Amino acid sequence: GVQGLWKLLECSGRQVSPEALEGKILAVDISIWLNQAENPHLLTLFHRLCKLLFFRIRPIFVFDGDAPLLKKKELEKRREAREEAEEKWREALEKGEIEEARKYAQRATRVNGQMFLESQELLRLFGIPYIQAPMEAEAQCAILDLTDQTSGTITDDSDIWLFGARHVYRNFFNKNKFVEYYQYVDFHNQLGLDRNKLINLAYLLGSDYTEGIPTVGCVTAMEILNEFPGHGLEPLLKFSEWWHEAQKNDTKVKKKLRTLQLTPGFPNPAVAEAYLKPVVDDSKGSFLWGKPDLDKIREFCQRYFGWNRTKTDESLFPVLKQLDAQ
């Protein structure tokens, strides 16, 4: 996500009823949901699949492959989360508990095996296709939208815009009544923002790939790009030089900017390249949608949520109904 980027874009969002999505092919990036904090993850995935098909959407789910990890913050927390599952794994083997030793073993690796496979299992059971992006899933989503293989992407992650996405639906899984639909043409025309300018905002505000500049929100960042015009990355290059000379040695804005702390390698052009030129598969090819398998799902919900036939059915029967109508 981006800090306050969704805030700059509010003016172009348009409320719509989930019923407005019937029949649309729409991508979902499931790797975001997996890479975050019985079987709570599965319960939430279950409900979200029920809601998508209840509204006759044709989802296409995208997992990461080898997704670049470029934020130092995440290269210390994802570096101190695998190196703490070893300390309790190696220990848990010297005690005796083998059931707990297979929990912290799937956390030691770069990507979990249990969630990946069980999530794919549930999708197959609902007849919902999925693909693996070669690298970052948000980029793959965007190229599907740009090649007209989807009508857009359901996600809360504003980085999707930096990858060139054009049609995005936000807040689809909250409890609120209307969901928010955003079009590039809109915020491009209402604010003049294009892909490069969004990228520069990400370098200032922070995004999935960069920490941002401490204390810099929508206000300071807009003032920075107002003060330093230019094309592509030129605005941040000029900003950086000013800030450097302004430490060597008069408005309110200049003063404020003067005090900010920029890292020595700022701006790092590799961030922009990773947003502008991601590895993605743009190849044509129809996806396929099955249908949900009722018995197999009653079983899955037994093994993992401990739901009896009837509890499972409370969530499934409405969905089966919507799939035959219309």
From Swiss-Prot:
Residues 133-228 are annotated as: I-domain. Changing F317A: Reduced protein stability, two-fold decrease in 15-nt bubble DNA incision activity and smaller decrease in Y DNA incision activity. Mg(2+) 1 binds at D29, D64, E136, E138. Residues 1-65 are annotated as: N-domain. Residues 30-54, 167-183, 195-227, 251-257 are annotated as: DNA-binding. Induction: Induced by replication stress caused by DNA double-strand breaks (DBS). It comes from the Eukaryota. It is found in: Nucleus; Chromosome. Changing L205P: In XP-G; reduced stability and greatly impaired endonuclease activity. The modification N6-acetyllysine is found at K7. Mg(2+) 2 binds at D157, D159, D208. Belongs to the XPG/RAD2 endonuclease family. XPG subfamily. Both nuclear localization signals 1 and 2 act as a monopartite signal which binds to the high affinity site on KPNA2/importin-alpha. Single-stranded structure-specific DNA endonuclease involved in DNA excision repair. Makes the 3'incision in DNA nucleotide excision repair (NER). Binds and bends DNA repair bubble substrate and breaks base stacking at the single-strand/double-strand DNA junction of the DNA bubble. Plays a role in base excision repair (BER) by promoting the binding of DNA glycosylase NTHL1 to its substrate and increasing NTHL1 catalytic activity that removes oxidized pyrimidines from DNA. It is linked to Xeroderma pigmentosum complementation group G: An autosomal recessive pigmentary skin disorder characterized by solar hypersensitivity of the skin, high predisposition for developing cancers on areas exposed to sunlight and, in some cases, neurological abnormalities. The skin develops marked freckling and other pigmentation abnormalities. Some XP-G patients present features of Cockayne syndrome, cachectic dwarfism, pigmentary retinopathy, ataxia, decreased nerve conduction velocities. The phenotype combining xeroderma pigmentosum and Cockayne syndrome traits is referred to as XP-CS complex. Cerebro-oculo-facio-skeletal syndrome 3: A disorder of prenatal onset characterized by microcephaly, congenital cataracts, facial dysmorphism, neurogenic arthrogryposis, growth failure and severe psychomotor retardation. COFS is considered to be part of the nucleotide-excision repair disorders spectrum that include also xeroderma pigmentosum, trichothiodystrophy and Cockayne syndrome. Monomer. Homodimer. Component of the homologous recombination repair (HR) complex composed of ERCC5/XPG, BRCA2, PALB2, DSS1 and RAD51. Within the complex, interacts with BRCA2 and PALB2. Interacts with RNA polymerase II. Interacts (via C-terminus) with ERCC6/CSB; the interaction stimulates ERCC6/CSB binding to the DNA repair bubble and ERCC6/CSB ATPase activity. May form a complex composed of RNA polymerase II, ERCC6/CSB and ERCC5/XPG which associates with the DNA repair bubble during transcription-coupled nucleotide excision repair. This is DNA excision repair protein ERCC-5. The chain holds residues 2 to 987 of 1186 of the full protein.
